[PDB]
Write an enzyme that holds these catalytic residues in place. Structure first.
Site, PDB file in Angstrom:
ATOM      1  N   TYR B 161       0.808  -1.204   0.000  1.00 50.63           N
ATOM      2  CA  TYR B 161       0.000   0.000   0.000  1.00 50.63           C
ATOM      3  C   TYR B 161       0.853   1.271   0.000  1.00 50.63           C
ATOM      4  O   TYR B 161       0.505   2.253  -0.649  1.00 50.63           O
ATOM      5  CB  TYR B 161      -0.935  -0.012   1.206  1.00 50.63           C
ATOM      6  CG  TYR B 161      -1.902   1.145   1.284  1.00 50.63           C
ATOM      7  CD1 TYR B 161      -2.791   1.397   0.261  1.00 50.63           C
ATOM      8  CD2 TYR B 161      -1.959   1.972   2.420  1.00 50.63           C
ATOM      9  CE1 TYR B 161      -3.701   2.458   0.336  1.00 50.63           C
ATOM     10  CE2 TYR B 161      -2.873   3.023   2.503  1.00 50.63           C
ATOM     11  CZ  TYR B 161      -3.735   3.257   1.448  1.00 50.63           C
ATOM     12  OH  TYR B 161      -4.647   4.277   1.505  1.00 50.63           O
ATOM     13  N   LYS B 165       0.567   4.344  -2.626  1.00 49.90           N
ATOM     14  CA  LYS B 165       0.261   5.698  -2.245  1.00 49.90           C
ATOM     15  C   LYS B 165       1.456   6.623  -2.507  1.00 49.90           C
ATOM     16  O   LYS B 165       1.248   7.753  -2.969  1.00 49.90           O
ATOM     17  CB  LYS B 165      -0.216   5.805  -0.798  1.00 49.90           C
ATOM     18  CG  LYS B 165      -1.515   5.085  -0.539  1.00 49.90           C
ATOM     19  CD  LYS B 165      -2.651   5.414  -1.506  1.00 49.90           C
ATOM     20  CE  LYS B 165      -2.966   6.881  -1.482  1.00 49.90           C
ATOM     21  NZ  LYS B 165      -4.233   7.197  -2.183  1.00 49.90           N
TER      22      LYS B 165
END
Ligand SMILES: [Cl-]
Ligand SMILES: [Cl-]
Ligand SMILES: [Cl-]
Ligand SMILES: [Cl-]
Ligand SMILES: [Cl-]
Ligand SMILES: [Cl-]
Ligand SMILES: [Cl-]
Ligand SMILES: [Cl-]
Ligand SMILES: [Cl-]
Ligand SMILES: [Cl-]
Lengths: 281, 280
Positions: B161, B165
């Site tokens: 993740y 991001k």
């Protein structure tokens, strides 16, 4: 310390920097599995996984050339399983497969972007993930990813597609360093301070000419070797080749210069061709 | 004011994206909004069509578009339709997102692809396609909903993740440099706390307020401030609450789901409030 009897899995490996790393590790009597998309010779880039394999063996190691597209996750799994069935476990994972285009977002179409993101960000993830279970038992396991330190000053945030891909590789490597810290697998990145001239460059230039501003692939091979012999606690570092080499005891970096006593050029994401305060030749 | 400006936004069906779309729309702006499917989901509220009605009700004009952000041609076609319809693009907001907090050991490649595809590749594709149609305009901004890049070990997980991001932010920051001459602004914006949206209440099964969270207005209002700054303001990785204090807001409690609570922190943030905030 020594990589004798140890097993390496390397993406790419068929020429240039990857080949030089493979050869150095092989010279200690190591096993090296190397994965590439195709086995057909290219008309302009030297080498295939098979000729890489011969050089690995002639250096003193055992070679396992594997055909597989790093962008196909099943092919990656199959290459790792094949490495494990043949050699019994993985000590070293080197993420070297790469892709380059230095254009802007305005110039680099999505298809080119995907090839860069695919091979480098996704590829480093898939290869590393697939290797990790087979590295947990081992004496001193290392993941080493051929990518640069994350530099956030504006000048370095360019060109976007390639910076995204290369920084993405580094972020993968640094994240893995945290997530595998308890399991004791090292994960580091390693990047050279100058451009590295490989046989492919000569071929494409079309001559037998001196790359006076550049260094030899050995600068990467020797630096990698130092890192792969450190304890698995040496982790989460974004390393430069020349710096690693001085810290290890090399005093004379000129042995890596394509032409000694030249003014050297700088790699992307690097301020200087030599470490701070370097006085050697 | 953003009267008569045109925005293209990924992930504007609900929550934060919808709040942003509604805040821009209230000035009489056009909002073109894209999503993979227009079919209602059993648990998540809203569709592009529902969101479109709310945009019109807020004061603007809406163009809802079925398009998979992971499909380059769908992105191209969504932008073309936006231009045929409204004539030009002043604002690009990258909000389509995807989340899984597992480690590299727990998140399979297929899942990784969803996050990489939507967020890193998606932000690239959407931004790339919008950019030619933003070159003429009075004050073009690209705004990407993603965090400052923090390199201290504790921020570098969970890896999958964080890659997505951070990749999102690196894209926004690269665009900032590459498009500076043009000069299209590119900035990122991130909230200091978790933002509680309708979807959250739906998945808990009760309408019960979230004491540690803020309302999505903190996102919408902070976006509005950034989007009205000159296009010279670019290459920043911003935090909602800080942007808001800089603009003159002195009371952040109006964004609190429950004023007077101890607030939680978002990923990649140390504190729920900006430094030396002594408001309520
Ligand atoms: Cl394309
Ligand atoms: Cl700079
Ligand atoms: Cl070479
Ligand atoms: Cl430097
Ligand atoms: Cl110096
Ligand atoms: Cl899953
Ligand atoms: Cl994808
Ligand atoms: Cl830390
Ligand atoms: Cl902070
Ligand atoms: Cl404080």
């Amino acid at each position: 310390m020594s990589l004798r009897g140890k097993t390496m899995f390397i993406s790419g490996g068929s020429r240039g920097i990857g080949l030089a790393i493979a050869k150095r590790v092989a010279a200690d009597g190591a096993n090296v599995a190397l994965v590439a998309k195709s086995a057909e010779p290219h008309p302009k880039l030297p080498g295939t996984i098979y000729t890489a394999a011969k050089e690995i063996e002639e250096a003193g190691g055992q070679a396992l050339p594997i055909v597989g597209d790093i962008r196909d996750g099943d092919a990656v799994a199959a290459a790792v399983a094949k490495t494990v069935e043949q050699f019994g476990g993985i000590d070293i994972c080197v993420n070297n497969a790469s892709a380059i285009n230095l254009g802007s977002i305005e110039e680099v179409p999505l298809k080119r972007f995907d090839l860069m993101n695919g091979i480098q960000v996704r590829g480093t993830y898939a290869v590393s993930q697939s290797c990790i279970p087979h590295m947990k038992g081992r004496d001193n396991p290392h993941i080493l990813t051929l990518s640069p330190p994350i530099r956030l000053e504006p000048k370095w945030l360019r060109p976007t597609p390639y910076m995204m891909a290369k920084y993405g590789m580094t972020l993968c490597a640094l994240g893995i360093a945290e997530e595998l810290r308890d399991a004791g697998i090292a994960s580091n990145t390693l990047w050279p301070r100058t451009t590295v001239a490989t046989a492919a460059v000569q071929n494409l230039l079309g001559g037998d000419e001196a790359m006076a501003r550049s260094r030899k692939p050995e600068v990467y091979a020797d630096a990698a070797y130092v890192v792969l012999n450190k304890p698995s606690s040496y982790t989460g570092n974004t390393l430069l080749c020349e710096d690693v080499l001085l810290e290890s005891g090399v005093t004379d970096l000129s042995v890596y210069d394509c032409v000694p006593g030249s003014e050297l050029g700088v790699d992307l994401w690097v301020d200087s061709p030599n470490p701070p305060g370097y006085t050697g030749p």
